Amino acid sequence: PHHIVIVEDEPVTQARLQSYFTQEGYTVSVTASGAGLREIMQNQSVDLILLDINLPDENGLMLTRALRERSTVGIILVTGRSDRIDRIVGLEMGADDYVTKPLELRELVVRVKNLLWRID
Amino acid sequence: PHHIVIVEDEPVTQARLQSYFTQEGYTVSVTASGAGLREIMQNQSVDLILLDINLPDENGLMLTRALRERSTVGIILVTGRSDRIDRIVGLEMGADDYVTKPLELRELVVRVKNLLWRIDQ
């Protein structure tokens, strides 16, 4: 199956997402940090990252920039509803797509499926 | 260079899209119908289509799946009516993205850039 990594600081949301994507057939890894992310990757093959850019003490747009500088991994950002700026900046950093909170899961899974089709 | 086709009935939207994408160095063709699109695609290769749902001949949602069933062509659907069944159906039919009027144009230019990069991988 395709390997998805969810980068999500908030434990409830972490579980909700991992649960939903596991239920849809994916190999899912979770991490709360960009260090966690950098670790799963150097150490495992990852097809797509769902990256919540509201990471306390961390810059998720610069994490995006770094990822795309190094690899063609799929990147879908999770942004807040007060984040218009982050949308365009996030795409400029190299994200393939973004979705906003609150997270509409049915639509997110279709975006993930379509991007994975492009990736593989 | 990359070839984009704009399929759009509303003239101001069509004019803004062709103008912005021409400045980015793309080769751009415009049309206002499914038939017009089909003619262009028989005559030249097309990398990416910006496609309105509202067309005079066939629904753009149906055009989307007809195209995607054969091709990896980029498809971004454009609508003037935020509507959930159109959005989910459109993405399920194979659209790479779905955007609403009035267009966030700078955002669309970057989306197009990234999608073309992704198709070229």
C-alpha distances (whole Å) from A75 to each of A39, A112, A119 are 16, 9, 11
The Cα B21–Cα B12 span in angstroms is: 14
The fold of A1-120 is Rossmann fold (3.40.50)
Residue with tokens 């309105």: B52
Indicate the residue type of B113: K
Tell which residue, A76, A66, A71, A86, has the closest CA to residue A17.
A76
The superfamily in CATH containing domain B1-121 is Response regulator (3.40.50.2300)
How many Å lie between the alpha carbon of B62 and the closest alpha carbon of chain A?
17
> Which residue in A has a C-alpha nearest to residue B90's C-alpha?
A110
> Which residue in B has a C-alpha nearest to residue A120's C-alpha?
B121
**Contact at CB, B114 and A96, closer than 8 angstroms:** yes
Tell which residue, B58, B48, B67, has the closest CA to residue B5.
B48
**Contact at CB, B88 and A96, closer than 8 angstroms:** no
A-side interface with B, Cβ within 8 Å?
A: 72, 87-88, 91-92, 94-97, 106-107, 110-111, 114, 118-119
> Secondary structure of A4-49 in the HEC alphabet?
EEEECCCHHHHHHHHHHHHHCCCEEEEECCHHHHHHHHHHCCCCEE
Experimental method: X-ray
The Cα A34–Cα A63 span in angstroms is: 7
C-alpha distances (whole Å) from A4 to each of A1, A73, A90, A94 are 9, 10, 19, 17
Phi, psi (degrees; rounded to nearest 5) at A113: -60, -45
The Cα B32–Cα B51 span in angstroms is: 9
All residues of chain A having their beta carbon less than 8 Å from the beta carbon of residue B110 are 88, 91-92
How many Å lie between the alpha carbon of A71 and the closest alpha carbon of chain B?
11
C-alpha distances (whole Å) from B59 to each of A102, A112, B62, B107 are 30, 25, 5, 25
**Contact at CB, B88 and A106, closer than 8 angstroms:** yes
DSSP state of A103: P
Mutate to test the interface with B, among A114, A116, A117 (most CBs of B within 10 A): A114
The token pair at B118 is 């992704």
> Which residue in A has a C-alpha nearest to residue B118's C-alpha?
A118
Helix orientation angle between A84-93 and B105-119, rounded to the nearest 10 degrees? 30
The token pair at A56 is 């306390």
How many Å lie between the alpha carbon of A88 and the closest alpha carbon of chain B?
5
The Cα A25–Cα A74 span in angstroms is: 18
| Three-class SS state of B105 | helix
- CB nearest to A91's CB, from B91, B114, B119: B114
Query: What is the resolution in angstroms?
Result: 1.8
DSSP state of A71: -
DSSP state of B43: H
How many Å lie between the alpha carbon of B66 and the closest alpha carbon of chain A?
16
Give the bridge partners for B30, in sequence order: B6
**DSSP H or E run through B6:** strand B3-7
> Which residue in B has a C-alpha nearest to residue A99's C-alpha?
B97
The Cα B93–Cα B112 span in angstroms is: 19
Helices (H), chain B: 11-23, 34-43, 60-68, 84-93, 105-119
Residue with tokens 């982050």: A86
How many Å lie between the alpha carbon of B68 and the closest alpha carbon of chain A?
11
The Cα B121–Cα B118 span in angstroms is: 5
